[PDB]
Assembly symmetry: C2
């Protein structure tokens, strides 16, 4: 329904996430105070990253299909 909360990022990791841990990603709601790409990991955890970091962009490109 339309009143659910949205996940927002407040602190980003500075460290590239080992690609073997990565299950998926999503972009955080633009209403959040900061931009965010959240990576979902094998153990079901969520890790905030900065979309403007080159490695985050590189990861997303290798994860996406055309």
């Amino acid at each position: 329904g339309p009143y659910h909360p949205s996940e927002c990022c407040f602190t980003y990791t500075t460290y590239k996430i080992p690609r073997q841990r990565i299950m998926d990603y999503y972009e955080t709601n633009s209403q959040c105070s900061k931009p965010g790409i959240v990576f979902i990991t094998k153990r079901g955890h969520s890790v905030c990253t900065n979309p403007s970091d080159k490695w985050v962009q590189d990861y997303i490109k290798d994860m996406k299909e055309n």
Copy 2:
């Protein structure tokens, strides 16, 4: 971990949630841009509410 996202509220409910639906609640991270109380319903819906609403505080009190 230290880099987990937090749930934040942007669109508050437009109705008083029937009490019977509610299983639990949590207050959102105070770092969110708006104050929020999220009620968790039986059916796994999370519903954002304004902690300044009397009915919300009344619910929390009773729970």
